[PDB]
Design a protein around this ligand. Structure first.
Ligand code: DMA
Ligand code: DMA
Ligand SMILES: [Mg+2]
Ligand SMILES: [Mg+2]
Ligand SMILES: [Mg+2]
Ligand SMILES: [Mg+2]
Lengths: 348, 348
């Protein structure tokens, strides 16, 4: 619902300054580090805000859907928000770095933080600081809470798992050398499972779970299960949308197969190819030349990725409900649906 | 004592493979991330080993000096080692990054990890992974221990405080632009307090403290106090040794005032200077030209940094004992002395 969803969004966004203050207020005057904390302020402000927040928001709504009447106090609510922004801070820490390693130029419609004159490789330390920030926020709101340790362990683990997924990326698709040798189906799936699924989907729910008291490992597996299908489909979708979508396209309806990106289409292609066609891709791909690009895509419609998607979004749903069945015994299915209704959308 | 000190050292070093195994054993076969964890192995092995280990060792000896007869079991001892290697892992995470941001070439006599062909900016993610490693080790050995949270909070905080000290460095002495404008006495002192003191001296003792049960904040301040004088003197010393030391000089008796390094001598200089002399430094400094370098140093002996040091190491000791007096009420002074006997040395 428009009214609720947005009322939720307005509170989240309206919450950012607070976090900013939390992180720097008493630091800005510090006769020793004041210059430093003052610079931090800028980093937060340049990088943390500006996404959609559907990640951070997920904690909130979940908590909302999980807590009991006793746990909807203002205090409890603020934490949920606070823990929400944490996921936001963490991902920013991530992205800032994805940017230096990719020699990217743009992000969220602003220039990469590293590209700002006067910054440079320094951003390397800046993302370390954005990552630190996450734990400073937790210490701040949840330190005197039974679930403190769980949440600490949970963020630290996800951090490692994404770094691994990242690591795999960095190794598979080196952005200065084409090699489609390693663009496999399981590598793509493995890169996706780690680099984003964990932190994009599991993390916000798991957080809310531990905050209501569900600390049961095997209840974490039932979530992890459904949630992992979810974020996988999601990555795929972003993947499809990038090339074949448009009407109402969420910001930058630009694109980037110029970057030898291990995307689903490429992979789904190389399985549908002939040996000529493979060397076709093998050449023209990862190329910032309008001509090659057109060819690349020709190839995709030439191979018919279009229906491959419709048939995939196809099974993807179905499967999910079944998974909703096997794994939402104790948890409120409501969760995974609302999440789903904002994730499955379409675009043919 | 040679015999003890070294017996302690041999166990520490002999402990590394274990950590390595801890970190990768069950990961190396993983059909999804195996390529990644296999690469991790290399990162650990290239970067973590090779220092002196006096940092990690400090936890051990302290624990040894603090525990009671009940707490010297093998198990307890392994943790101390394990927590020791953690400080080692963390600093490595640090250095690997100090290297990319400084465009350095060498480290611990090997080439910077980032300079290895095939690596590059990727190391940015590698140090993230070295940092993750620290918490994986803690989860492994101290998860079922009363002091788990304290140690988790302690490493996370230090991480932030050094990053700040780093941040200050990065801003004060930008390695591609001389500017001695900001080389002040308090900036140097502030950079030193944060970038190294905290993690080099306070951290290993504080860790041992919490492991024996001293979780008292104000007992952490009494340590912090003495310890901070310590690591400050230490940085200074490294600083002096770099330029004016030699006979038996610990590895690379090379040097680096070619890098516009905010070192103590520079600062101590700019306070002893004339306005001519200042522009002298202002020019020749941060220069990889044998001629300038000689001038630079001429200046230092020209100004007489030599005795300024002897007079500083001078007060530095004294002060310490006094601090040992005001602050080792409840803790065993033995600690800070042994630490001191390996730190104060001299070299005129
Ligand atoms: C969450 C994370 C590590 C994203 C990096 O992905 P990417 O290198 O494929 O680039 P982009 O910023 O376009 O996703
Ligand atoms: C512990 C830490 C962040 C060291 C970086 O110091 P540096 O940039 O002054 O260079 P070096 O490696 O010579 O100390
Ligand atoms: Mg990128
Ligand atoms: Mg990338
Ligand atoms: Mg350096
Ligand atoms: Mg530096």
């Amino acid at each position: 619902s428009p009214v609720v969803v947005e009322r939720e969004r307005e509170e989240f966004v309206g919450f950012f300054p607070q976090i900013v203050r939390d992180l720097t207020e008493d630091g800005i005057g510090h006769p020793e580090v004041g210059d430093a904390v003052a610079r931090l302020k800028e980093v937060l402000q340049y990088n943390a805000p500006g996404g959609k927040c559907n990640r951070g928001l997920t904690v909130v709504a979940a908590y909302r859907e999980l807590s009991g009447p006793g746990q909807k106090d203002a205090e409890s609510l603020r934490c949920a928000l606070a823990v929400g922004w944490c996921i936001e801070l963490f991902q920013a820490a991530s992205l800032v770095a994805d940017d230096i390693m990719d020699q990217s130029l743009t992000r969220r419609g602003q220039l990469c933080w590293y590209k700002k004159e006067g910054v440079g490789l320094d951003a390397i330390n800046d993302s370390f600081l954005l990552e630190s920030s996450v734990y400073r926020v937790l210490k701040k709101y949840c330190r005197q809470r039974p679930y403190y340790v769980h949440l600490l362990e949970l963020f630290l683990q996800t951090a490692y798992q994404t770094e691994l997924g990242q690591m795999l990326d960095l190794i598979t698709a080196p952005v200065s050398k084409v090699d489609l040798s390693h663009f496999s189906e399981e590598r793509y799936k493995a890169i996706v499972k780690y680099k984003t699924a964990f932190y994009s989907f599991y993390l916000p729910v798991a957080a809310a779970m531990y905050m209501v008291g569900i600390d049961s490992k095997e209840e974490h597996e039932n979530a992890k299960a459904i949630l992992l299908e979810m974020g996988e489909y999601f990555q795929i979708q972003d993947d499809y949308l990038d090339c074949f979508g448009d009407p109402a396209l969420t910001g930058a309806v630009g694109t980037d197969i110029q970057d030898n990106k291990c995307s689903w289409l490429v992979v789904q292609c190389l399985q549908r190819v002939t040996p000529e066609q493979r060397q076709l891709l093998e050449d023209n791909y990862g190329r910032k030349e309008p001509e090659k690009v057109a060819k690349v895509k020709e190839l995709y419609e030439a191979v018919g990725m279009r229906a491959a998607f419709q048939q995939y979004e196809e099974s993807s749903y179905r499967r999910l409900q079944e998974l909703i069945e096997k794994h939402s015994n104790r948890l409120p299915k409501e969760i995974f649906l609302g999440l789903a209704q904002k994730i499955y959308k379409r675009q043919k």
